[PDB]
């Protein structure tokens, strides 16, 4: 009961790998490559995580909301917006297939966007660089998911990173979005759209400018909705995250501190139900007296 989360390393070997990934209740880091941010100025908004890749695993994270900027032709630069968190996609990479390596039960759902213009060196698309470099890179061989199936179970991902494309049309086609049409995001909303070529409804709340007290009753909105929600062919995902404080505290530390318990209760009182995918500030980032988001939503997969 208390089990899954007692061991976040290997949470996920634990389930019936027949479970479809969509079926799964997963914590992600939302900015995942924030924690190398140290400057105190530049981190009061802009830094959303204190742990790196590795820990944010060990710690039980598995959705990964990896924000890049072309900074060569044959290079993804890790950014949160115009700032720049010194390293290059091929670190977080590196880090999934080590610790797939290890705990080969395990998937990790990566998430890909562009999340800034390209130095004015480089000459191709975000996507082509991505594509061309990264995915069909001869060294992340057996690294990403590469099947067909739109709607994949752990048993087809284990060991493996699956794409959730947020670059617009992709050449690429293995993973959530990966068709020429890619994932119709809308900004600052609560949405909902069908992604590979209709085989998936992606329901989405990433109300980012709210407010405090409208962002969380944004979060236990499509909470509810998930909570009754068993058809497989629905992926939620849910972002805890939110800019400027919800414009009730002076930093994203500070806001994370109130809403990822305030969540974590919420979850806790409604038992082992349906949650989707949460995307959080500060994942794995405890306090004492207070209930731990990415636990409770571990620990709210039923076995
Ligand atoms: O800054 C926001 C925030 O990071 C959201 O979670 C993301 O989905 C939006 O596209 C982005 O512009
Ligand atoms: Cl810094």
Redo the contacts with the bound molecule.
């Keep these: 009961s208390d089990s899954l989360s007692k061991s976040p390393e290997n949470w996920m070997s634990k389930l019936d790998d027949g479970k479809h990934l969509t079926e799964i209740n997963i914590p992600g880091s939302?900015?995942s490559g924030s924690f190398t941010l140290k400057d105190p100025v530049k981190s009061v908004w802009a830094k959303t995580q204190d742990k790196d890749y590795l820990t944010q695993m060990k710690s039980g994270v598995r959705f990964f909301?990896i924000?890049g900027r072309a900074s060569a032709d044959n290079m993804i630069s890790v950014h949160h917006?115009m700032v720049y968190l010194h390293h290059e996609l091929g670190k977080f990479l590196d880090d999934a297939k080590y610790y797939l390596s290890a705990y080969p039960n395990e998937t990790i759902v990566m998430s890909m966007?562009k999340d800034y213009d390209s130095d004015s060196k480089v000459t191709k698309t975000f996507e082509e660089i991505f594509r061309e470099y990264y995915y069909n890179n001869p060294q992340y061989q057996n690294l990403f998911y590469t099947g067909s199936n739109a709607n994949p179970t752990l048993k087809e991902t284990k060991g493996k990173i699956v794409l959730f494309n947020?670059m617009g049309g992709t050449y690429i086609k293995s993973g959530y979005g990966a068709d020429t049409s890619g994932i119709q995001?809308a900004?600052n909303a609560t949405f909902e759209t069908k992604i590979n070529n209709g085989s998936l409804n992606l329901k989405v709340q990433?109300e980012?400018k709210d407010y405090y007290d409208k962002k969380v009753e944004a979060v236990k909105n499509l909470l509810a909705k998930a909570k009754t929600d068993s058809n497989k062919d629905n992926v939620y995902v849910n972002?805890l995250?939110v800019?400027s404080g919800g414009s009730a505290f002076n930093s994203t530390y500070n806001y994370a501190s109130h809403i990822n318990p305030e969540i974590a209760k919420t979850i806790k009182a409604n038992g082992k139900a349906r949650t989707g995918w949460l995307?959080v500030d500060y994942a794995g980032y405890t306090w004492p007296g207070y209930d731990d988001i990415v636990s409770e939503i571990i620990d709210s997969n039923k076995l």
Excluded: C, E, L, V
């Design positions: 939302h900015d909301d924000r917006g966007k947020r995001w900004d990433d980012y972002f995250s800019a995307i």
